[PDB]
């Protein structure tokens, strides 16, 4: 085989041979499999079931002997730096997550021990980190619009946080990349966030200079709303509901009620009625309280930007205020309901409390995790799987609430979002 | 409005006496006025002035009635407030100081600006291309700039729309992919030309040299690899410009890559050039460039993979990696065309010349046919007694003139 | 009121209210008391009672705040830089160590050792070695202090970084003569890395030219976290703390799976302290015997030849640590037995039960002797320590006849030259 | 033969071939010569002596290499040229070629152009340059004493300027670069200015990272006046005392009177009798009204920095009081007797006015010259041939001036100062 070897890119520590232990290509460890499959897919932005990889702790640290590796991975002959890098915060991170298995307090603080660890959370920063949702499949129009708003974000030196994939997960940092270099902000800090499960299908892209691998969809999500100094939110399907429904029902808390910080839902002139539309779900589901905690802004990409940026002030005053960390919102209150990991099978699916007699909060965190079973359905590996062994996923409740969950997923395949 | 703007380590200080030259007062404070005018600008704002002031830190500049556009939610662009600050700073360095002399001062300035890096390896490519072209064109340019930037390579062209942009759009990600922070954007501009071909801000090193002929000589001492987008008049003299040198007996061992690139819908403008290049040229002319279509990386892996042989190269002639100062150049190259009606109707256009002295005049000729068209003085001579009148052999003229009738027909213009 | 507010600029880390949490600050809390009682002796580099340390998490990070602090961690005024760096130094090793409960025993102690010098940014992954460990008396005449000064210059001059204990004497010359020679060399990356653990700090306080401090738990895990990172071993005349230092590194490297060690040891000093080292050098050949020699060399009055030893031998430890396939920062491949890493805690139970006969590996001999040494320290300068000298009498000491001999000589040379 | 290679980092521009031909080693231009002897003296930190040194000045790939044909070779470490060496021998370099690349308006502008050429003036910088004078030859107790003074700068960050050569010249940058480790001070600023007749006698230190030569003495003067922000006076001889008078005839000027950079000599327990008779010189001379400038601080380093720390925020309010520079002191007012240089001679120093009776301004700038000639005639190579063509200069003026200048002179030869 083709053996390309990896040396150590930016700044991984030393490791010793206790924490490298497990992901020996042995037993199983089942960790070399998930180890691999991540790595795989970082150079990948049964196809390759010959490629492998081997962890060497060497003299300046780990270095990464690659078996097989995809060859688009390479420019002329070289991994593109930026790849190597995610391939070592995939170690870091596999690892990190598994010396720290050892309750909502555990996840959270989990949560921060992981983004510390991963050097996500900057001690002195200032506030200026915006989350930035949106979908996997979007067409043109939509894909220039999400790379639009992230130029505007660059022109305000504001840092990218999102999910890794193609579509509107990549738009916002092309566009930045030539918003921050008329800035000159050479700082810029674009963070792509993923976990095992969904980066195969959603890869980051090289651009992405800070990548984390969260251990599940729940405790990114907990990583995406602790550290969002602000939200912008693309057209998107299914995964895009899961985390407006997410971020809703937290913001929702009475507990909540005073955390400034902005959800913009913004998107060109063509994504008038998909806007329309999922504003009229959300008021028909959780209701006509949910509205105060988001703003539509429809064709103006500077607009979208120019919200995330006026807010930085008053979210480091309110930080300031509860006596909380900028980079880390610990005094948001994220209840249980939010952070137990989902997973959707067709007991767990059929077992959803979908009810509009509940108070938005709890009927948020229920739909939460109805949309986190449609795309996991879609595109995880296990999901697929018993969507193999026994069809689609059923859901049932109040038949108000299951017939317009029904519309908004139709709209989805009809716009071609699944 | 009224803005004031302070370096960020991008200036140095500056004496009263090279200050007092620039007061609203006359020569000087009109093309520096003017200069920073259009790099805010990137006619309708005659209420516009800047004030250096001379500041216990250094300079500050004030900026009275500055274009909007410069503003993002109310302050300027950083990039802006960097080439404000590289416009003083040419303007001084040149209005504060004999091929050989013309040579030095390229340098001189080139020095001056920071643009020559003593301990840097060979990675810069000079890019040109048209102005105006269409949606394939750009985005075409922008693929070969992603592709520069993932090869760690540095851009160095002029200023404005079209391919002087795309690439720059391009490797801003193709670098921040590679982790390149210390990619070199840098515009070469000139005070006649620069208002029509403004600078982005996304140049990280803006030169304001003192004419196009001093811009063409910094362009090639400076470019370890060129890349010619399909473009206009203005490319078609740059291309003749470096062929007209490249063809000099004394060139044969130079080893710069010439490549001309575009998509596939710009075959034929291709050929058309080809052809249009070897006829006047003749034959020996092709072995100085190649042409790729149709692939963005393939033109910058050929970029990449010269820069071996310009590094040894130049240490064959105990030469500098930033200029080539072995390069031969003429002087038909250097002397500054200031080009009207007469100038334009004196021109030496005949097929009977050996190429490098037909180069030189073609040179001339396109470069008339872009004063014609963008300069201030130029479209006042032009407007004053119409077309700038050409004359030369009969074959030549029809045929130089077909080109300039397709740049029409493509919108080039 | 003297209550001042510490800012840290980079390196302190986040931390979570967990971790601050178990800090326990209350009155009954020893570990508070500790961490009250290092950060104490880091500002004044009892006479206290008043002194308070409070950590804030804020919304850059940690913020502290002391109440009544010394008078001379100021310059007009304001906190040394290196000092507020210390301070956030010592926040940081109290609660990594405090978060780690965290194989075989042995394993456990050298992967703590690591864990503990990770954490403080103490190995630098891609660094290049060149990293000296300095060892020598904290109480010295001018003229040694003098020859340590110089010795560090030389040092800085080649561009080698410098790892050592903490306080006075030989402890501190070399780092003030290293300013001066990286200045010269333009050596601004240049490490001064100061070691120290809880129940030693005051005595022997971190001065601010320190960059680098770091809190180990014990004198023990100091030892391993010395011989690890060094590339290179510099010891200058000391007294019973600087012998222990030199037992358990001859120890360590007599060991017969150490023999490809190639970190050099370079005992030297003024021209005056070549009877000094005449009857340290018997006295390994005596107790350890002669293959103890092959491990070191002896360099007098003169400075450049200790440094250029140390300068010209890092490319064999670099091709050294290829060749085992081990970190630069970090030698995992030397071999420390568990008689090395054992805490030893000094009583009078513990010191008669040392075994001090002839009849064992050399290895084995040294093992002894580092904790012997080890005793008669703690004895001198430590709180529990000296209780027992108070509180039950001087400690006491048997074995064989010979070896107590030359021992009791080395202790008494020690005091007479008033190095203890 | 030896030939060493010197390859500068950066901190060297190319130079063009017209500039490097003026440094061809010819029969004798002097600018050969000149540069020659300077790379020489930096080479000898640490004459027929090194008869056959030359050095060639070459442009390769990088810019300048520099040949050197048998240096000295005593202050190279393990074979090599220590750093900072090899950074003075392109600071020469630099300075040589922009000198002979190029009327009180005229003087002035020339030595901020030679300064702002060399990095000497950082636009951004808030005023905290210490200059510090002293003896070149100086004891054991006095040389500790000026280390103690640079750790004392060092602790308030303060950048030092100084006159290069040994004794004063090099031990306050010793402590300083303590007291600058002590507060992470990585920025320091260790200016040593010198001129190419005197560099051979007082060559520079490694340890100094910005080294200027300035054209000449009176220039070096200017440099160092118009840079300052505070002024530290250590005890010395002939040329120290030169110092002192043309600083003092300057601040005397009513023009000068806000101008608020502190004067202070200091120096340890044992040079109070030193400072009681340099003191009483001064003010028998330049009168009563001089004392005003300057004040005496003996036996305490910290006190002496502690002034010029505690004068940084007085030296930033007057200079944009004045709205002048913070680098460049543009608006101190300095007469032309304090610019014209001066060639000493035994005509040149018999014209001298030492006269009783003359604007005190005057006779500090004629005093100047005087301790200038003495200088030059104890360490000059056309100072000394002056001397052995014709015996010492002969000075004469107001007896009672004489014999105090003659008491003053003869003290230094006393103390071991010349």
Redesign the interface.
């Given at each position: 085989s083709l053996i390309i070897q990896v040396s150590?890119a930016?700044?991984?520590?030393?490791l010793?041979?206790?924490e490298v232990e497990r992901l020996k290509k042995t037993a199983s460890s089942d960790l070399y499999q998930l180890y691999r499959n991540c790595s795989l897919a970082v150079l990948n932005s049964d196809k390759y079931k010959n490629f492998d990889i081997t962890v060497?702790?060497?003299?300046?640290?780990i270095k990464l002997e690659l078996a097989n590796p995809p060859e688009h991975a390479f420019?002329?002959g070289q991994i593109?730096?930026?790849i190597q890098?995610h391939l070592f915060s995939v170690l870091r991170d596999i690892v990190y997550v598994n010396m720290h298995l050892a309750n909502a307090?555990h996840i959270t603080?989990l949560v921060?021990?992981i983004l510390?660890n991963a050097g996500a959370?900057i001690?002195?920063?200032?506030p200026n980190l915006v989350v930035c949702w949106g979908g996997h499949s979007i067409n043109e129009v939509e894909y220039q619009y999400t790379r639009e708003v992230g130029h505007e974000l660059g022109?305000?030196e504001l840092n990218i946080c999102t999910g890794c994939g193609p579509g509107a997960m990549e738009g916002p940092?092309?566009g930045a990349?030539?918003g921050?270099?008329?800035?000159?902000?050479?700082e810029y800090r674009?963070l792509g966030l993923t976990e095992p499960s969904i980066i195969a299908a959603e890869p980051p892209?090289?651009?992405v200079?800070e990548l984390v691998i969260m251990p599940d969809i729940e405790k990114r999500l907990e990583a995406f709303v602790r550290m969002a100094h602000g939200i912008i939110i693309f057209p998107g399907g299914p995964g895009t509901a899961e985390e407006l429904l997410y971020i809703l029902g937290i913001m929702m808390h009475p507990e909540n009620a005073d955390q400034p910080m902005p959800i913009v839902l913004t998107g060109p002139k063509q994504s008038e009625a998909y806007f329309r539309s999922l504003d009229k779900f959300i008021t028909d589901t959780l209701g006509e309280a949910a509205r105060k905690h988001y703003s539509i802004a429809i064709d103006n990409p500077a607009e979208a930007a120019?919200i995330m940026?006026?807010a930085m002030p008053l979210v480091?005053q309110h930080?300031?205020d509860k006596?909380?960390?900028?980079?880390?919102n610990?005094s948001l209150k994220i209840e249980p309901e939010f952070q137990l990991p989902f997973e959707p099978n067709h007991e767990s699916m059929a077992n959803l409390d979908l009810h509009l007699n509940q108070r938005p909060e709890v009927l948020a965190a229920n739909l939460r995790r109805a949309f986190s079973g449609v795309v996991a359905g879609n595109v995880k590996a296990e999901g697929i799987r018993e969507i193999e062994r026994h069809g689609p996923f059923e859901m049932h409740g109040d038949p108000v609430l299951m017939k317009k969950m029904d519309q908004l997923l139709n709209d989805f395949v009809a716009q071609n979002r699944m």
């Open positions: 150590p930016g700044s991984m520590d030393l010793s041979q206790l060497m702790r060497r003299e300046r640290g420019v002329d593109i730096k930026g890098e307090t603080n921060f021990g510390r959370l001690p002195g920063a200032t022109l305000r940092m092309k990349a030539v921050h270099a008329k800035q000159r902000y050479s674009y892209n090289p651009i200079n120019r940026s006026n480091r930080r300031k006596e909380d960390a900028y980079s880390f610990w």
